[PDB]
Amino acid sequence: IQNQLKKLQSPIILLYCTKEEATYIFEVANSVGLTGYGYTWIVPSLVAG
Amino acid sequence: IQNQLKKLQSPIILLYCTKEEATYIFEVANSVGLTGYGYTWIVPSLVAG
C-alpha cells in the first residue's frame, strides 16, 4: 500500500473491507501517507463499527 | 524514499552520495521498488567503491 499510494490519490475513495481488519488497515494506510485523505473515506454503517 | 518512488521515475538518474552509506541506501531503494532502475544508476569511480 506504500507503493499503492500513487493509485489512491482521489478526492473521494470508496472503501469496502472488514472492520475487524480495518482497525489495522486504516492505521497502515495512515502510515502509508494517506492520513490527510484518511478522514475522507466511505463505509456503510453496516460495514462500519 | 518509499513515498519518493513517484519522483524517481526516470530512464537515467544521477546519484551522488557516500559509498559507505550507499550500501545501506541502495538496498533501501531496492526495497522501495526501484530495483529495476537499480541497475541504471550513475556514480563516478571516485564515488564508487
Swiss-Prot record, chains A, B:
**Superkingdom of the source species:** Eukaryota
Reported tissue expression: Expressed in the hippocampus including the dentate gyrus (at protein level). Detected in adult olfactory bulb, brain cortex, hippocampus, striatum, thalamus, superior colliculus, with much lower levels in inferior colliculus, midbrain and cerebellum.
Modifications after synthesis and translation: Phosphorylated on tyrosine residues.
Where located? Answer: Cell membrane; Postsynaptic cell membrane; Late endosome; Lysosome
Similarity comment: Belongs to the glutamate-gated ion channel (TC 1.A.10.1) family. NR2B/GRIN2B subfamily.
**What the record says about its domains?**
The extracellular N-terminal domain (ATD/NTD) endows NMDARs with a unique capacity for allosteric modulation, harboring several binding sites for small molecule ligands that act as subunit-specific allosteric modulators of ion channel activity.
What this protein is reported to do is described as: Component of N-methyl-D-aspartate (NMDA) receptors (NMDARs) that function as heterotetrameric, ligand-gated cation channels with high calcium permeability and voltage-dependent block by Mg(2+). Participates in synaptic plasticity for learning and memory formation by contributing to the long-term depression (LTD) of hippocampus membrane currents. Channel activation requires binding of the neurotransmitter L-glutamate to the GluN2 subunit, glycine or D-serine binding to the GluN1 subunit, plus membrane depolarization to eliminate channel inhibition by Mg(2+).
Share what the entry says about its subunit structure, partners included. Heterotetramer. Forms heterotetrameric channels composed of two GluN1/zeta subunits (GRIN1), and two identical GluN2/epsilon subunits (GRIN2A, GRIN2B, GRIN2C or GRIN2D) or GluN3 subunits (GRIN3A or GRIN3B) (in vitro). Can also form heterotetrameric channels that contain at least two GluN1 subunits and at least two different GluN2 subunits (or a combination of one GluN2 and one GluN3 subunits) (in vitro). In vivo, the subunit composition may depend on the expression levels of the different subunits. Found in a complex with GRIN1, GRIN3A and PPP2CB. Found in a complex with GRIN1 and GRIN3B.
Protein name stated in the entry = Glutamate receptor ionotropic, NMDA 2B
Q: Which organism is it from?
A: Rattus norvegicus (Rat)
Q: Which gene encodes it?
A: Grin2b
